[PDB]
Write an enzyme that holds these catalytic residues in place. Structure first.
Site, PDB file in Angstrom:
ATOM      1  N   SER A 185      79.994  -1.557 -41.255  1.00 22.34           N
ATOM      2  CA  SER A 185      79.338  -3.096 -40.772  1.00 22.34           C
ATOM      3  C   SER A 185      79.055  -3.213 -39.158  1.00 22.34           C
ATOM      4  O   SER A 185      79.796  -2.064 -39.019  1.00 22.34           O
ATOM      5  CB  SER A 185      80.862  -3.698 -40.788  1.00 22.34           C
ATOM      6  N   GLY A 186      78.611  -4.390 -39.302  1.00 24.96           N
ATOM      7  CA  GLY A 186      78.159  -3.767 -38.027  1.00 24.96           C
ATOM      8  C   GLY A 186      76.892  -3.436 -36.989  1.00 24.96           C
ATOM      9  O   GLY A 186      76.347  -3.207 -36.092  1.00 24.96           O
TER      10      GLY A 186
HETATM   11  O1  LIG Z   1      84.567  -5.077 -51.714  1.00 24.51           O
HETATM   12  C1  LIG Z   1      84.547  -5.019 -51.141  1.00 24.51           C
HETATM   13  C2  LIG Z   1      83.557  -4.297 -49.720  1.00 24.51           C
HETATM   14  N1  LIG Z   1      84.279  -3.831 -48.454  1.00 24.51           N
HETATM   15  S1  LIG Z   1      83.592  -2.584 -47.791  1.00 24.51           S
HETATM   16  O2  LIG Z   1      84.429  -1.798 -46.699  1.00 24.51           O
HETATM   17  O3  LIG Z   1      83.307  -1.455 -48.728  1.00 24.51           O
HETATM   18  C3  LIG Z   1      82.247  -2.658 -47.060  1.00 24.51           C
HETATM   19  C4  LIG Z   1      81.869  -3.532 -46.051  1.00 24.51           C
HETATM   20  C5  LIG Z   1      80.377  -3.684 -45.552  1.00 24.51           C
HETATM   21  C6  LIG Z   1      78.946  -3.378 -46.269  1.00 24.51           C
HETATM   22  C7  LIG Z   1      77.389  -3.690 -46.519  1.00 24.51           C
HETATM   23  C8  LIG Z   1      76.488  -2.983 -47.192  1.00 24.51           C
HETATM   24 CL1  LIG Z   1      75.057  -4.135 -46.558  1.00 24.51          CL
HETATM   25  C9  LIG Z   1      76.430  -2.933 -48.647  1.00 24.51           C
HETATM   26  C10 LIG Z   1      78.049  -2.157 -49.495  1.00 24.51           C
HETATM   27  C11 LIG Z   1      79.388  -2.717 -47.716  1.00 24.51           C
HETATM   28  C12 LIG Z   1      80.666  -2.252 -48.379  1.00 24.51           C
HETATM   29  C13 LIG Z   1      84.476  -4.923 -47.332  1.00 24.51           C
HETATM   30  C14 LIG Z   1      85.295  -5.838 -48.778  1.00 24.51           C
HETATM   31  N2  LIG Z   1      85.049  -6.211 -49.880  1.00 24.51           N
HETATM   32  C15 LIG Z   1      85.441  -7.610 -50.127  1.00 24.51           C
HETATM   33  C16 LIG Z   1      85.312  -8.709 -50.915  1.00 24.51           C
HETATM   34  C17 LIG Z   1      84.437  -9.199 -52.160  1.00 24.51           C
HETATM   35  N3  LIG Z   1      83.616  -8.520 -52.505  1.00 24.51           N
HETATM   36  O4  LIG Z   1      83.882  -7.855 -53.920  1.00 24.51           O
HETATM   37  C18 LIG Z   1      83.947  -8.984 -49.160  1.00 24.51           C
HETATM   38  C19 LIG Z   1      82.907 -10.317 -49.709  1.00 24.51           C
HETATM   39  N4  LIG Z   1      83.725 -11.539 -49.326  1.00 24.51           N
HETATM   40  C20 LIG Z   1      82.770 -12.567 -49.375  1.00 24.51           C
HETATM   41  C21 LIG Z   1      83.797 -14.334 -49.694  1.00 24.51           C
HETATM   42  C22 LIG Z   1      83.129 -15.520 -49.411  1.00 24.51           C
HETATM   43  N5  LIG Z   1      81.646 -15.541 -49.097  1.00 24.51           N
HETATM   44  C23 LIG Z   1      80.615 -14.529 -48.827  1.00 24.51           C
HETATM   45  C24 LIG Z   1      81.724 -12.930 -49.438  1.00 24.51           C
HETATM   46  C25 LIG Z   1      84.959 -11.562 -49.381  1.00 24.51           C
HETATM   47  C26 LIG Z   1      85.924  -9.847 -50.228  1.00 24.51           C
END
Ligand SMILES: O=C1CN(S(=O)(=O)c2ccc3cc(Cl)ccc3c2)CCN1CC1(/C=N/O)CCN(c2ccncc2)CC1
Ligand SMILES: [Ca+2]
Lengths: 235, 51
Positions: A185-186
């Site tokens: 991230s970032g």
């Molecule tokens: O599933 C996850 C994955 N992690 S992570 O730490 O491994 C993570 C963090 C940054 C990343 C950036 C890239 Cl380019 C690719 C993979 C990544 C994985 C972060 C949090 N989550 C939970 C979330 C759910 N996804 O399954 C991530 C996005 N969400 C929203 C909500 C409303 N609008 C947009 C997005 C809410 C919680």
């Protein structure tokens, strides 16, 4: 970084690592100038106090070529919201100037129009970091990089269980097991043009890591260019 | 004109000024004399891998 190659000496000099007091690397960052670092805003929530590190490629083998810097001011985007990840950007003004040497150099800030027209129309971009090697895995000890193709905006919205706003864009693969992941991230997303790399996206979020049918969601730098300039004057 | 031809043959930024093309470079570069290429001004120009 899941998959991808290792950042070889000198290949990812614009990388920056945010570290907590425990000294662990928790987020990524992009070197813009000697005094400024670009990062995700949600990253200013995974640690109380943190420093920014540059020139590092192996979090355990003291290459001796590293250098730690303190944050004087953190400029987080006001409209940033955790509930939608919209406006997931932030700029860090350093306390001391970054001395550029091997593995320590800034990524270029492109022009808004040229970027959208000639950079994001490129087939691919580069994302890098010290993040997890696998979704369930552990943070990486080495700095990695991954060539991630630009994703059709429609395909993006369709594959996303969340609203992909005008401030974001997709990049990565539908099935291939490669994509950024936690800890990245970032970090920087750069696009290459005639051997010069330009900043294009800030590692924002995803639904898991490299999951089938999901893409990597990055912050659209070109949509915050002017905002970034304004910050260079600390505002 | 035609920055869509081959980036107007510019090293970096390309702008069409009604008639022809107008090349420019990121902060830290200076436009070459051919009005197209970009040349570094310091030893650590932005966007360059340090090898
Ligand atoms: O599933 C996850 C994955 N992690 S992570 O730490 O491994 C993570 C963090 C940054 C990343 C950036 C890239 Cl380019 C690719 C993979 C990544 C994985 C972060 C949090 N989550 C939970 C979330 C759910 N996804 O399954 C991530 C996005 N969400 C929203 C909500 C409303 N609008 C947009 C997005 C809410 C919680
Ligand atoms: Ca090291």
């Amino acid at each position: 970084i899941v998959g991808g190659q290792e950042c070889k000496d000198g290949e990812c000099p614009w990388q920056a690592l945010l570290i907590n007091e425990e000294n662990e690397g928790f987020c990524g960052g992009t070197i813009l100038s000697e005094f400024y670092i670009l990062t995700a805003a949600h990253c200013l929530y995974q640690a109380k106090r943190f420093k920014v590190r540059v020139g590092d490629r192996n979090t355990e083998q003291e290459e001796g070529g590293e250098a730690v810097h303190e944050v004087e001011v953190v400029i987080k985007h006001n409209r940033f919201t955790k509930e939608t990840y919209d406006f997931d950007i932030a700029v860090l003004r350093l306390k001391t100037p970054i001395t550029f040497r091997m593995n320590v150099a800034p990524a270029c800030l492109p022009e808004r129009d040229w970027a959208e027209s000639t950079l994001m129309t490129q087939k691919t971009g580069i994302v890098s970091g010290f993040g997890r090697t696998h979704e369930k895995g552990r943070q990486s000890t080495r700095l990695k990089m991954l060539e991630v193709p630009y994703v059709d905006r429609n395909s993006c919205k369709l594959s996303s269980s969340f609203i992909i706003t005008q401030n974001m864009f997709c990049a990565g693969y539908d099935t291939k097991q490669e994509d950024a992941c936690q800890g990245d991230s970032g970090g920087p997303h750069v696009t290459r043009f005639k051997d010069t790399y330009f900043v294009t996206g800030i590692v924002s979020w995803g639904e898991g890591c490299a999951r089938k049918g999901k893409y990597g969601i990055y912050t659209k730098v070109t949509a915050f260019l002017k905002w970034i300039d304004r910050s260079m004057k600390t505002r | 004109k035609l920055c869509s031809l081959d980036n107007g043959d510019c090293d970096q930024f390309c702008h069409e000024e009604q008639n022809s093309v107008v090349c420019s470079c990121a902060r830290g570069y200076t436009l070459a004399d051919n009005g197209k290429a970009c040349i570094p001004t310091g030893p650590y120009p932005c966007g360059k891998q340090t090898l």
